Amino acid sequence: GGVQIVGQDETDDRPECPYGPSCYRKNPQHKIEYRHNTLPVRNVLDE
Numbered sequence: 001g002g003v004q005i006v007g008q009d010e011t012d013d014r015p016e017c018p019y020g021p022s023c024y025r026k027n028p029q030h031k032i033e034y035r036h037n038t039l040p041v042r043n044v045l046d047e
């Protein structure tokens with residue numbers, strides 16, 4: 001039970017993929033080991 005993004009799996013502290021904007025790989029551990037930007041995914045307004 002739970003169809004939202006409130007505690008997916010403690011994955012909010014990625015470091016930084018080297019590719020960055022030029023990253024065209026699709027791996028399961030890559031999306032969780034290295035991020036591709038620097039923005040939050042939940043606190044962007046606070047009301």
Ligand SMILES: [Zn+2]
Nearest residue numbers: 017019020023
């Ligand atoms: Zn990457």
